[PDB]
Amino acid sequence: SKVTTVVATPGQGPDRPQEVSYTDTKVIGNGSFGVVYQAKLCDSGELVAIKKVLQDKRFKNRELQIMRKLDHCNIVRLRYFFYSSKDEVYLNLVLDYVPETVYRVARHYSRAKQTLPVIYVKLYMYQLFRSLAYIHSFGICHRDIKPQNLLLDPDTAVLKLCDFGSAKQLVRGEPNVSYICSRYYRAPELIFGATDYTSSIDVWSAGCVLAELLLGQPIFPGDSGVDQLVEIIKVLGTPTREQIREMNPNYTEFKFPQIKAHPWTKVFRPRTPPEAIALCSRLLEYTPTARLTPLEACAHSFFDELRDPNVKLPNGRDTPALFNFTTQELSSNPPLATILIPPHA
Ligand SMILES: O=C(Nc1ccccn1)[C@@H]1CCN(C(=O)CCc2ccccc2F)C1
Ligand SMILES: [Cl-]
């Protein structure tokens, strides 16, 4: 029956603080940056996650500034934020609580020697690509796409991208650090130490998630960058000098095993949908500019089942909102609306 009452600022809308009381506070992880609590809002009884992070006095929090601009069905919702306190200041991000992650669901299937039904692979990957299409339209790259950062409501099948702690607006000409993004999901250009990478690193990472959901395990594992590259070269083949330059190591000797392109069909298990494999090959490309855009991925034939008017979830419910595209979200390529928004929508 303990209640904490704070004066917190809404995430969206004008900077107008209000009194917010929450209860049933409990720790649900230490996210390196700080602690993450779960709580229940007294008024509505809705569950929230509170991400407590040490506030730098010098500059405003980049995660916060990005989160306040974002408003999308497939991105974790910032309800409130407030400051508290050691004698240092802590920023608290109050987020809509989502009970599961793709990581946890995938692992349950994995250690039961089962593959996740393709319907869920389609649903999760499509919603990820929508979230990426949205943030990329602002020039914002996530830079840490991985199964742990993909929240899931198992009932509604709604996926929400979270953890914008590494997220940044990439401006052509300005260099960016190459040591972001988690091991297994790092694009080759990042491994090669490129600082002139684009939002297409997120597409590579998304491709790694797709393959993982199909395979039941990470496609490019390895404790070192060298090990990872070998696993990449085993699938994609040895990168041509042309492809190397576009990834952008520049100065640093080449010298990889001269291995042939292992055909994509033999990578996955026998009855893996051909379109799933086709999609992978167009996401996991050496040349960054050669990779599909998020919006192009959404319109790929692998997701056709989702656009079928009779499609429903295995639990009987309707699919979540898949077609409520905005102008912002479609700006990369508006003509695609004729595929993305089907007749019945
Ligand atoms: O954290 C969650 N939801 C959430 C978090 C932040 C914002 C919205 N929703 C769920 C509830 C518990 N989850 C977990 O994966 C276990 C907790 C956990 C373990 C290790 C590292 C971090 C962490 F949060 C996923
Ligand atoms: Cl599920």
Author numbering: 35 to 119, 123 to 382
Which text from the study accompanies this structure?
The binding position of G12 in the ATP pocket completely differs from the one of G5. Direct hydrogen bonding interactions are observed between pyridine nitrogen and carboxamide nitrogen with the backbone atoms of Tyr134 and Val135, respectively. Electron density corresponding to the fluoro-phenyl group is not very well defined, suggesting that this portion of the G12 molecule is lacking adequate stabilizing interactions with the protein. Overall, backbone interactions offered by Pro136 seem more relevant in G12 binding to GSK-3β compared to Arg141 side-chain interactions. Activity data, therefore, showed that despite the two selected molecules having very similar IC50s and being ATP competitive, G12 does not compete with the substrate.
Glycogen synthase kinase 3 beta (GSK-3β) is a serine-threonine kinase known for its ability to regulate glycogen synthesis and to play a critical role in many intracellular pathways, such as the signaling pathways involving insulin, growth factors, and neurothrophins (Wnt pathway and insulin pathway the most known). The central role of GSK-3β in many intracellular pathways makes this enzyme an exciting and puzzling target for drug discovery. This widespread activity has also led to identifying GSK-3β dysregulation as responsible for the development of many diseases, such as Alzheimer’s disease (AD), bipolar disorder, diabetes, cardiovascular diseases, and cancer.
